[PDB]
Point group: C3
Chain length 317, copies 3
Amino acid sequence: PGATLCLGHHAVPNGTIVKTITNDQIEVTNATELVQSSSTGGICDSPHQILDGENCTLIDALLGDPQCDGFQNKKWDLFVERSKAYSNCYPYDVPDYASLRSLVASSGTLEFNNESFNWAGVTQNGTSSACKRRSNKSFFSRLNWLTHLKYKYPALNVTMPNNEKFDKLYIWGVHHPVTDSEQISLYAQASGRITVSTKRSQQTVIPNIGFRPRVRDISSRISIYWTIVKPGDILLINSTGNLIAPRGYFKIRSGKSSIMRSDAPIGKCNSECITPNGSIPNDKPFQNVNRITYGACPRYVKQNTLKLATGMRNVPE
Amino acid sequence: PGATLCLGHHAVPNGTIVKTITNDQIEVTNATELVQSSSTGGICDSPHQILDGENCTLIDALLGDPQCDGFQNKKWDLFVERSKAYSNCYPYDVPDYASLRSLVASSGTLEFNNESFNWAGVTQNGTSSACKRRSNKSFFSRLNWLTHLKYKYPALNVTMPNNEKFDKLYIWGVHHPVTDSEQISLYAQASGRITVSTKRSQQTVIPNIGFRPRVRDISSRISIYWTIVKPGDILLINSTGNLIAPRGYFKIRSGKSSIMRSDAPIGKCNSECITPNGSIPNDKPFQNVNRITYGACPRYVKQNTLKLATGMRNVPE
Amino acid sequence: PGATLCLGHHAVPNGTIVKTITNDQIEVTNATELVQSSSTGGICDSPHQILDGENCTLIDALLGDPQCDGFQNKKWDLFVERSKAYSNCYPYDVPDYASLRSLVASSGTLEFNNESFNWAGVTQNGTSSACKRRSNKSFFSRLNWLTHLKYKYPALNVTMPNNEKFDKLYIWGVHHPVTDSEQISLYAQASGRITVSTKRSQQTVIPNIGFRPRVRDISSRISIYWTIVKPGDILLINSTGNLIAPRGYFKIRSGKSSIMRSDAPIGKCNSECITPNGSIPNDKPFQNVNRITYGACPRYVKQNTLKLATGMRNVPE
Ligand SMILES: *[C@@H]1O[C@H](CO)[C@@H](O[C@@H]2O[C@H](CO)[C@@H](O[C@@H]3O[C@H](CO)[C@@H](O)[C@H](O[C@H]4O[C@H](CO)[C@@H](O)[C@H](O)[C@@H]4O)[C@@H]3O)[C@H](O)[C@H]2NC(C)=O)[C@H](O)[C@H]1NC(C)=O
Ligand SMILES: *[C@@H]1O[C@H](CO)[C@@H](O[C@@H]2O[C@H](CO)[C@@H](O[C@@H]3O[C@H](CO)[C@@H](O)[C@H](O[C@H]4O[C@H](CO)[C@@H](O)[C@H](O)[C@@H]4O)[C@@H]3O)[C@H](O)[C@H]2NC(C)=O)[C@H](O)[C@H]1NC(C)=O
Ligand SMILES: *[C@@H]1O[C@H](CO)[C@@H](O[C@@H]2O[C@H](CO)[C@@H](O[C@@H]3O[C@H](CO)[C@@H](O)[C@H](O[C@H]4O[C@H](CO)[C@@H](O)[C@H](O)[C@@H]4O)[C@@H]3O)[C@H](O)[C@H]2NC(C)=O)[C@H](O)[C@H]1NC(C)=O
Ligand SMILES: *[C@@H]1O[C@H](CO)[C@@H](O[C@@H]2O[C@H](CO)[C@@H](O[C@@H]3O[C@H](CO)[C@@H](O)[C@H](O)[C@@H]3O)[C@H](O)[C@H]2NC(C)=O)[C@H](O)[C@H]1NC(C)=O
Ligand SMILES: *[C@@H]1O[C@H](CO)[C@@H](O[C@@H]2O[C@H](CO)[C@@H](O[C@@H]3O[C@H](CO)[C@@H](O)[C@H](O)[C@@H]3O)[C@H](O)[C@H]2NC(C)=O)[C@H](O)[C@H]1NC(C)=O
Ligand SMILES: *[C@@H]1O[C@H](CO)[C@@H](O[C@@H]2O[C@H](CO)[C@@H](O[C@@H]3O[C@H](CO)[C@@H](O)[C@H](O)[C@@H]3O)[C@H](O)[C@H]2NC(C)=O)[C@H](O)[C@H]1NC(C)=O
Ligand SMILES: *[C@@H]1O[C@H](CO)[C@@H](O[C@@H]2O[C@H](CO)[C@@H](O[C@@H]3O[C@H](CO)[C@@H](O)[C@H](O)[C@@H]3O)[C@H](O)[C@H]2NC(C)=O)[C@H](O)[C@H]1NC(C)=O
Ligand SMILES: *[C@@H]1O[C@H](CO)[C@@H](O[C@@H]2O[C@H](CO)[C@@H](O[C@@H]3O[C@H](CO)[C@@H](O)[C@H](O)[C@@H]3O)[C@H](O)[C@H]2NC(C)=O)[C@H](O)[C@H]1NC(C)=O
Ligand SMILES: *[C@@H]1O[C@H](CO)[C@@H](O[C@@H]2O[C@H](CO)[C@@H](O[C@@H]3O[C@H](CO)[C@@H](O)[C@H](O)[C@@H]3O)[C@H](O)[C@H]2NC(C)=O)[C@H](O)[C@H]1NC(C)=O
Ligand SMILES: *[C@@H]1O[C@H](CO)[C@@H](O[C@@H]2O[C@H](CO)[C@@H](O)[C@H](O)[C@H]2NC(C)=O)[C@H](O)[C@H]1NC(C)=O
Ligand SMILES: *[C@@H]1O[C@H](CO)[C@@H](O[C@@H]2O[C@H](CO)[C@@H](O)[C@H](O)[C@H]2NC(C)=O)[C@H](O)[C@H]1NC(C)=O
Ligand SMILES: *[C@@H]1O[C@H](CO)[C@@H](O[C@@H]2O[C@H](CO)[C@@H](O)[C@H](O)[C@H]2NC(C)=O)[C@H](O)[C@H]1NC(C)=O
Ligand SMILES: *[C@@H]1O[C@H](CO)[C@@H](O)[C@H](O)[C@H]1NC(C)=O
Ligand SMILES: *[C@@H]1O[C@H](CO)[C@@H](O)[C@H](O)[C@H]1NC(C)=O
Ligand SMILES: *[C@@H]1O[C@H](CO)[C@@H](O)[C@H](O)[C@H]1NC(C)=O
Ligand SMILES: *[C@@H]1O[C@H](CO)[C@@H](O)[C@H](O)[C@H]1NC(C)=O
Ligand SMILES: *[C@@H]1O[C@H](CO)[C@@H](O)[C@H](O)[C@H]1NC(C)=O
Ligand SMILES: *[C@@H]1O[C@H](CO)[C@@H](O)[C@H](O)[C@H]1NC(C)=O
Ligand SMILES: *[C@@H]1O[C@H](CO)[C@@H](O)[C@H](O)[C@H]1NC(C)=O
Ligand SMILES: *[C@@H]1O[C@H](CO)[C@@H](O)[C@H](O)[C@H]1NC(C)=O
Ligand SMILES: *[C@@H]1O[C@H](CO)[C@@H](O)[C@H](O)[C@H]1NC(C)=O
């Protein structure tokens, strides 16, 4: 009679369909998903240092909008900007806004150091009812609105050397009055001009008098500029009116900091990968949650699923 | 005696050479080409909506050059700009020309809506012999050349609210006269200035008096600017001379529209993929016709041929 | 008794570990390295035409700094800029510096042709003690500092047609005096203005009077501009003061030229691939020396080694 000896392999009742080079649908015994397609919905506060902007854009926190005083000198790995954020100070613009936002975001600090600028012969600390703190007239915390002193505004020609080891970031502005009479009222002369320089750079800005649509009841504007001063270089501000003066400098660092627009709530939890939709697990190589990511993240792809076979072809009985 | 039974495979007398991982030349029984290397030479008018610019650049059709009146309010999927196109109006430039061209191309419409601007106290509808229609002096159709009225040009301070659901695109300009006397002749004062603003943006432009080389017998110039006004925002134009005024706004849409530079003839035929050399079939995954494409196109590669084996190794008798 | 016949394969005592799809460490009989990770440390002078900038940036060689006269009319495949380079002329800036540097680098020539500009009614060839040659006061070789003649500076309105087959590159500038009295001293009027135009472009620049920090004992500045003039177009310079005039044009070519920042010494040797660290062999497909390359180079990757098996699995006795 003898014997029979059969060689074989396993199978399962519940196989999974995968793609191959020669067939778009072949059943295997098991597979694993390579695309992360879900988020928790919240941004985990760990292990990156998260700073929720709340009502403040980064730029408003930089300048010192009345609603942003709690942000002074804070650092972040990721600054989270909310869609509801709005300004509540003097109406302003920033030529190149995107670049200033980017460079501050990347620096990852609002560390500010006051300096003693000699603003000889003018009135300091101007305020406005468009920028209140506690119902008092106020202004951006990091800027100094200079006006005439006894109807004189003598030329400013002011120096500030950088004798530090690090670069200094200076934020400053120009005031664009609504009318010729507002110009004379504030600065005691018919126009102004501002030249801000270092040994290696120069910027000059001319105020432009005229009506813009009222924002927080103001038809004038401030335009914001910036200047970086290297170790052993010197900031020189030369102006005859309309200067929104710096009060000091921001530290500028390099590192892994960034900024993200998101309305996701921040949670007490730990996740390396952040998207605007919330944190996502990072076990998988790919993800289809968002092209926008921060941290150790899977790579964004268009597919919502990619199944890797982890078993043989399934050939059921 | 018994029998002989031989297993085998086919071969062909006319095999084709392909590349593999281990050999750059191996003969197989059959192959197919994966690189599209030929075009029809014409651009098929279907199924994309093609607009042939003919003598008009997109920007000339936007502004309303005399040769471009047939383009009013037209839409396109693909605007085709011809190398022979030339201007036949007042000589102009557009700072950022490439961006305005791009944003209009992408919007895919020249839909224009007139608005009733209150140009109080000035002469409207200025014309020039450098911009004729039917031998009459004329001007860009979408712009309004304002000049003095009885040797006065009172300050303009004009508002236009956007109470629509959509964004408005405003095109406007500044006139740069050739001399101080041309300046006084046209505007009744020694210089002008233009500030165009919204709640969230501002642009001011100063005219620059002087000689440029004559183009269509004109040594002055117009410089063209634009402003986008969001729903619930307000356009404000504040000017004292030299304003080339808007007559209304363009609609701005988003969608799949673009622009292509090509001299290929447009034909009555149907092809999904357009290149500057003409339409190409899109059965193949790759193509070497042109890096510039529009529609459902094969991907541009440097190779002029890539043969995919569709049969076994050919081993002839 | 019969015989035994065994089939087998070789092995070696000194195998090498490679990576595969299924195993990160498998020993094979032999392998070859696909990542170039070392350089010679020097840049080979062959076969690309190398121009060592020595003390001169490309822009200083363009303008004609006193230390750069040996560079006149030189050509290069690769201009090598040294970190020690410094300027020794009048302090200047170039708005868009990076673009002018790039376009000259890519052109690959400093070929200069003098032209006879009619600077009627002014003093030519101004010099300064901040820009000495051989202890004499001097100036940039390719620029012409115009000042008043007998306390008059009549308006300049000067033309230069391009009747060549090629494009002309014009370099010119604006002088920004330190004070109102320096302005009057040099130009005999209270301000200047410069409009440089062609049939298809225009640039106007306003001088900005004021103090900048002293560089080589100078608190004023020059700002450098450029203009390209096509065949059959015409350069027109219209100015009333502060013009740093062109002396002629640079040829502008297209080809394979570039610029590299490196402190590597130049050697007498032959290598197709240049990096800032020195030339590297180009037998391998990949390299991890530097992302910055010029010539026929392996592709930059992050890995420092990638071993390709060139033999079977090693199975020692
Ligand atoms: C189908 O194929 C997949 C992929 O092979 C397979 O999934 C794998 O299953 C194993 C076993 O369950 C998982 O191993 C676990 O991994 C987690 C980390 O995420 C560990 O926490 C687990 O630890 C347990 O066991 C340890 C033993 O030392 C203990 O230390 C500890 O107490 C834990 O209880 C464990 O190592 C592995 O993560 C997955 N892999 C993937 C990619 O999902 C799945 O099992 C297969 N299914 C079938 C039906 O065969
Ligand atoms: C070498 O290999 C290639 C690739 O396999 C092979 O080319 C293929 O040939 C087949 C058969 O001729 C083609 O099939 C045709 O495809 C077109 C679409 O482009 C259809 O219009 C054709 O329809 C005909 O037959 C249909 C049957 O139902 C009818 O509906 C109709 O009336 C038509 O007459 C047909 O399906 C196929 O497109 C190509 N593929 C490629 C990539 O070219 C070629 O035949 C092989 N050569 C040899 C000598 O073996
Ligand atoms: C392990 O695998 C590698 C890769 O296969 C293998 O390296 C190769 O070795 C051969 C033989 O030494 C090399 O061939 C030489 O290539 C150089 C060019 O760089 C030539 O100059 C050499 O020419 C000599 O021989 C010629 C014969 O006609 C003569 O013309 C001349 O006089 C020269 O003496 C020769 O062709 C080849 O370059 C390498 N390849 C790589 C990628 O390194 C290595 O030998 C293997 N090791 C073992 C132990 O098996
Ligand atoms: C130039 O044009 C602008 C824009 O039209 C004019 O601005 C407008 O000025 C009026 C008068 O001051 C403003 O009215 C105010 O509205 C607020 C809000 O309801 C109200 O609280 C005040 O009591 C007053 O009614 C109006 O807001 C403002 N509009 C805009 C869009 O800014 C300006 O007056 C013109 N200038 C001249 C000199 O004509
Ligand atoms: C750059 O800084 C300098 C240094 O302060 C400024 O120059 C100075 O400007 C003042 C006032 O504008 C000048 O004084 C005036 O002199 C005239 C002429 O006699 C007189 O009519 C006025 O009543 C007043 O006294 C001063 O002369 C001048 N100093 C120098 C050394 O030139 C300059 O204004 C600053 N630039 C900017 C853009 O602010
Ligand atoms: C400033 O310089 C410019 C450039 O050289 C001068 O422009 C030139 O002006 C002359 C005189 O008007 C123009 O001549 C005209 O040429 C046309 C074309 O053939 C002809 O039809 C007219 O009858 C006349 O001859 C010339 O075209 C023009 N050149 C350029 C390049 O624009 C300008 O005159 C100078 N201004 C002053 C005040 O000197
Ligand atoms: C921005 O829009 C306003 C509103 O029209 C313009 O301000 C107004 O400008 C006019 C004419 O330039 C001023 O009138 C002049 O007053 C002087 C001083 O008495 C007189 O010498 C002139 O004969 C003329 O009457 C008017 O006062 C002024 N209005 C206000 C409220 O300040 C302004 O010009 C516009 N800006 C631009 C850049 O166009
Ligand atoms: C406006 O402010 C600037 C910046 O503080 C002043 O520039 C400074 O001017 C002084 C006086 O000329 C310069 O002093 C010189 O220093 C050199 C170098 O040691 C020395 O050789 C000279 O004998 C003299 O002492 C100083 O270098 C310069 N500083 C900078 C940073 O540029 C300018 O004087 C002010 N203008 C007015 C009108 O007040
Ligand atoms: C653009 O080039 C033209 C052509 O030279 C310049 O225009 C000319 O400028 C001069 C001097 O600025 C003017 O002369 C002056 O006339 C007045 C009025 O009588 C007088 O007070 C002065 O003493 C002097 O004679 C000349 O009239 C004028 N020519 C023309 C045809 O308008 C212009 O200045 C140049 N632009 C720039 C930005 O340099
Ligand atoms: C994560 O958020 C993104 C961004 O909002 C979502 O992507 C959008 O999805 C909507 C459909 O509801 C599309 O209309 C948009 O085109 C997408 N936005 C952009 C900017 O491309 C996405 O659905 C979210 N993913 C998960 C897993 O929650
Ligand atoms: C399609 O048009 C392109 C663009 O003109 C052609 O590519 C050019 O080919 C010429 C040779 O005649 C080269 O000198 C140029 O370098 C190419 N132009 C550019 C801009 O790179 C191409 O030959 C055409 N292809 C087909 C199939 O007609
Ligand atoms: C070639 O030069 C580059 C550039 O300096 C070297 O890369 C740097 O390596 C240092 C470590 O000493 C790092 O701190 C820097 O991040 C690298 N620089 C940049 C700009 O990324 C590299 O080591 C050199 N390679 C060889 C083979 O000599
Ligand atoms: C098949 O069933 C087993 C046991 O319930 C399970 O662990 C495995 O993941 C299933 N296969 C699927 C879901 O494809
Ligand atoms: C943000 O602003 C809203 C009003 O716009 C206010 O209700 C809320 O309390 C503010 N939040 C903070 C943190 O200041
Ligand atoms: C301006 O305000 C600061 C506090 O913000 C104060 O220290 C300083 O003395 C004030 N200076 C003047 C001149 O008012
Ligand atoms: C070989 O000949 C057949 C019959 O003529 C043809 O259909 C096939 O495409 C040919 N092979 C080529 C052109 O490589
Ligand atoms: C375009 O311009 C040329 C003359 O430059 C003319 O012959 C042709 O008819 C014009 N075409 C159209 C459509 O206006
Ligand atoms: C300007 O021209 C338009 C037609 O283009 C006309 O409706 C309008 O009445 C004219 N206005 C003036 C003031 O000439
Ligand atoms: C093994 O030894 C031989 C002979 O010395 C040598 O040629 C070969 O490259 C060696 N293998 C290595 C270094 O992996
Ligand atoms: C470059 O400058 C240094 C001084 O800074 C000098 O020693 C050297 O000789 C100069 N080299 C050349 C080639 O001019
Ligand atoms: C200016 O200098 C050049 C030599 O650099 C000389 O040929 C020319 O004659 C000089 N012109 C004047 C007006 O000084």
